[PDB]
Design a protein around this ligand. Structure first.
Ligand SMILES: *[C@@H]1O[C@H](CO)[C@@H](O[C@@H]2O[C@H](CO)[C@@H](O[C@@H]3O[C@H](CO[C@H]4O[C@H](CO)[C@@H](O)[C@H](O)[C@@H]4O[C@@H]4O[C@H](CO)[C@@H](O)[C@H](O)[C@H]4NC(C)=O)[C@@H](O)[C@H](O)[C@@H]3O)[C@H](O)[C@H]2NC(C)=O)[C@H](O[C@@H]2O[C@@H](C)[C@@H](O)[C@@H](O)[C@@H]2O)[C@H]1NC(C)=O
Ligand SMILES: OC[C@H]1O[C@@H](S[C@H]2[C@H](O)[C@@H](O)[C@H](O)O[C@@H]2CO)[C@H](O)[C@@H](O)[C@@H]1O
Ligand SMILES: *[C@@H]1O[C@H](CO)[C@@H](O)[C@H](O)[C@H]1NC(C)=O
Length: 603
């Protein structure tokens, strides 16, 4: 007879209700399971009724795989899922945190800390629209972004994934959501999940909650603060996400006053679902429930019981799916976990799938392949990189002539430094590989290539990665551009207590600037000990992690556009002042939040 749930013309809540009622326990638990592509097989997806798949950082079909190879891989998996009794399509997720970053040839936008320096929410909304098209170009429909953490201590390895230490800026940057998912209707009800169509993707606000406020910036550790402080610093952005229809929310590994977020029913069910009225589904982090205990994974049975009762809806296992499914089934059969909780989770997961049109368009669009790395997107990234640059110093003394903007025509100039010709360093973490990489890992323009593309044909450009002092003095250069900074890092490997750039870095700046007027470009994911660098150079620019379009840096260096960026974080004098944020009593910074010198166009 007539099957309601398959009727595309019926309202979403009806299709969900009709489908839920036909499902067996095995099929329901299947929808709550997300596994890595590395352990997926057509048989596994079919026999276990899997509901979702993902690619962790660096998990790709092949190195250098084209957009069509990605589409074929995703469709292959979807084929299996659609061949099940009920034909429920799977949803594929990936970390597209600054462009479709796991993919070769995808446009790489500046990381969030830099985007905060632009104070331009409209720009970020456009990046969201471009990112969605590039994710859809590879057949993927779900992005694990944006991270709306409020980094309160730069020693944290993920501070660069945070827009600012000021929650007001983070709130305005939630405009990324409507860019990724599409604008919500006028009749929209805060808390409902929303996705416009096949050229948009479901978004994910992470990590709930207080992930950027851990002690000493230790990744995944404990956030010690009172409820009121939690509610006015770390929670605000989540309410904004609700008003914009964010489809899902990911739970943090961190704990609040000793309680693991992955087991906190007060905040997950009590606040997020019952108070904020969130109607999308809640997903865990990678092996998030395993780390509820210590050691991790030492009592998986308890992990499943605690997280599911706490209120999670989908579990990013992501490898040992047999144990997860077996243990969860046991708890239900034993009455330890009520069927209503299961039904609630599956209802939320299906609501999102039906709303985004998954049942009507389960496969990839071969025509979208041309969207990967298109010039219009690169021009946008270029504009973003340029607006994210913060000019900290322009002339050694107040009576010195301004070094920037530099003239495009000069007899001979010098480009030096470890970061002057290294695309990987320029992109930082979450680029191609999980931790990022060194060298030419994808398609883009380095700072050296940008300079050569900008100067007058009569200008002689000489490159030297680490020149000694007399090479510089006898070279007869008009000026030099030196680029140095941090190396790529992600998550815990990013936790740093000293916050000083690696060598050679300071020595290169000293050797070069000692011989000729120099403009120093600092590449980093956060503020670092800068005094020495500041003392040696005539001009210093904070470029953060600009991404693949290096011409964004030179557009401002040679005067095509003026500097407009402003500090999104507080720049400390020394690490023992930390934590130190705008508002504190001991607030004595080297540069205050909002600081930034400017210039006007034309060299
Ligand atoms: C301030 O704190 C930080 C963090 O704690 C500390 O840096 C970390 O130091 C670790 C040492 O315990 C180091 O672990 C070793 O890493 C070796 C390989 O490291 C290279 O490859 C990784 C990627 O796998 C990069 O992240 C590293 O930056 C490094 O990269 C190479 O570095 C060299 C030297 O600068 C450079 O010439 C190469 O071009 C570059 N190539 C690449 C791949 O980019 C392993 O072999 C070894 O087994 C350890 O695991 C951490 O990697 C490092 N963390 C990062 C991300 O930097 C820092 O320590 C200072 O810097 C390091 C590099 C070293 O010179 C120390 O002697 C020095 O003290 C510390 N600084 C201060 C002020 O103490
Ligand atoms: O990628 C999904 C999810 O990941 C966790 S970190 C995760 C890496 O993806 C994986 O490549 C490596 O082997 O393990 C780590 C375990 O910590 C991240 O917190 C989250 O933001 C992301 O969406
Ligand atoms: C926090 O990090 C410290 C560092 O060793 C560790 O001993 C402690 O168990 C961690 N606690 C939390 C909240 O994860």
């Amino acid at each position: 007879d007539y099957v309601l749930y398959k009727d595309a013309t019926k309202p979403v809540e009806d299709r969900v209700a009709d489908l839920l009622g036909r499902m067996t326990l095995a099929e329901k638990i299947g929808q709550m399971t997300q596994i890595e592509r590395l352990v997926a097989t057509p048989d596994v997806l079919r026999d276990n009724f899997i509901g979702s798949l993902l690619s962790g950082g660096g998990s790709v079909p092949r190195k250098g795989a084209t957009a069509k190879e990605w589409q074929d891989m995703v469709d292959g998996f979807q084929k299996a899922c659609m061949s099940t009794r009920l034909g429920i399509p799977m949803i594929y997720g990936i970390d597209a945190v600054h462009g479709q970053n796991n993919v070769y040839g995808a446009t790489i936008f500046p990381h969030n800390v830099g985007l905060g320096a632009t104070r331009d929410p409209y720009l970020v909304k456009r990046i969201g629209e471009a990112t969605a098209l590039e994710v859809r170009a590879t057949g993927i429909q779900y992005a694990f972004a944006p991270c709306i953490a409020v980094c309160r201590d730069p020693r944290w390895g993920r501070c660069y994934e945070s827009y600012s230490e000021d929650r007001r800026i983070v709130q305005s940057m939630t405009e990324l959501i409507p860019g990724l998912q599409g604008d919500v209707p006028k009749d929209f009800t805060s808390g409902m999940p929303f996705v416009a169509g096949k050229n948009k993707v479901a978004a994910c606000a992470k990590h709930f909650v207080g992930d950027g406020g851990t002690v000493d910036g230790i990744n995944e550790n404990n956030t010690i603060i009172n409820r009121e402080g939690l509610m006015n610093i770390h929670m605000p952005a989540y309410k904004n996400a609700m008003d914009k229809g964010v489809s899902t929310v990911m739970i943090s590994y961190s704990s609040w006053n000793g309680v693991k977020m992955h087991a906190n029913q007060d905040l997950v069910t009590g606040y997020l679902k019952d108070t904020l009225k969130f109607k999308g589904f809640v997903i865990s982090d990678w092996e998030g429930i395993d780390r509820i205990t210590t050691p991790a994974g030492s009592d998986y049975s308890y992990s499943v019981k605690a997280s599911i009762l706490a209120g999670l809806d989908m579990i990013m296992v992501p490898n040992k799916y047999q144990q997860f499914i077996s243990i969860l089934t046991g708890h239900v059969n034993g009455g330890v976990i009520p069927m209503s909780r299961i039904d609630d989770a599956v209802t939320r997961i299906l609501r999102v799938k039906f709303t985004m049109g998954l049942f009507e368009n389960p496969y990839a669009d071969p025509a979208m392949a041309e969207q990967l790395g298109k010039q219009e997107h690169r021009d946008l990234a270029r504009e973003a990189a340029r607006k994210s640059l913060v000019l900290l110093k322009n002339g050694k003394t107040s009576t010195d002539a301004p070094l920037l903007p530099l003239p495009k025509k000069a007899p001979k100039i010098l480009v030096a430094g470890s970061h002057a010709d290294n695309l990987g360093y320029q992109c930082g973490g979450w680029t191609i590989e999980w931790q990022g990489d060194t060298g030419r890992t994808t398609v883009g323009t380095t700072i050296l290539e940008a300079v050569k593309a900008a100067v007058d044909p009569s200008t002689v450009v000489v490159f030297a990665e680490n020149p000694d002092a007399e090479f510089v003095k006898s070279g007869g250069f008009s000026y030099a551009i030196v680029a140095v900074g941090e190396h790529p890092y992600t998550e815990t490997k990013g936790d740093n207590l000293n916050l000083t750039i690696p060598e050679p870095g300071l020595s290169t700046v000293q050797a070069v600037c000692g011989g000729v007027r120099c403009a120093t470009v600092l590449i980093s994911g956060r503020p670092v000990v800068v005094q020495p660098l500041l003392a040696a150079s005539d001009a210093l620019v904070a470029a953060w992690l600009p991404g693949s379009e290096g011409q964004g840096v030179t557009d401002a260096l040679f005067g095509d556009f003026g500097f407009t960026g402003r500090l999104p974080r507080t720049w400390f004098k020394s690490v023992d002042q930390l934590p130190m944020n705008v508002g504190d009593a001991h607030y004595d910074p080297l540069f205050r939040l909002g600081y930034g010198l400017t210039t006007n166009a034309t060299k």
